[PDB]
Amino acid sequence: INPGNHLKIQEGTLGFFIASDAKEVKRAFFYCKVKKYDSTGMFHWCAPKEIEKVILTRSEAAMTVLSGHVVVCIFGDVSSALIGLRNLVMPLRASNFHYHELKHIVFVGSIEYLKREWETLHNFPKVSILPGTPLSRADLRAVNINLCDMCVILSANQNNIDDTSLQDK
């Protein structure tokens, strides 16, 4: 994706294009004239961490000034399905970013549900958890949601709910 001034284009490189219709792109062919990184080396890696070193409280979060972060609220419980939160964290920790240019993450959800997915996340850096529920204004203001960069909302029990209508309420 966008190499610059160090690549010479070979024959039949098959570039991708953006245009209105496939007829207009046709004019292109007819031209008239320390373990910080993963083993692969693509995502930052860290030693496994116990969940008690990342579980926070309201006072801990209020002391810990978090700015320029991402808040991912989660609705769920011990009997709901799984979303694969590792699949969400993974694109956000690429080797492209520098270590101090990364984005902090917190989770505002039920710790009992989050146990079932914490075993797939301990290898990632700069992850924090705040137990509670997203509806609590105290919990929302603890993570300084005013200064956040994005506030993702999900729902683990979206599919298996009872009522056909009234979804994601």
Binding site: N2, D38, F97, N123
Partner: protein, 119 residues
Amino acid sequence: RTLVTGGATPELEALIAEENALRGGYSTPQTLANRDRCRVAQLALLDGPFADLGDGGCYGDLFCKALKTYNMLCFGIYRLRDAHLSTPSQCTKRYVITNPPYEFELVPTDLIFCLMQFD
């Protein structure tokens, strides 16, 4: 997948297929040039070097200048809803413009999609 996942390469695919997880590694002179890839970012044409085209500059002129200057690929525009209307307001919501034509004006309150290289 290689644009939005972060990396979808034969090496990582083979490693994931073999292991079903990831393992920590070590830094080497090789496999560290793999960092050089383009990411996604948004500029701000108010205080940067591109602020001089924020009045009525041509989108294609801005694109060509960005390329010939810093290899700086720009292909999307984030613009306020009532930007077309001259009546001032306090609306924050912005729509998304994909693939602008060359003869395009630039509102001074524009947010521009971008991809940037690695330093």
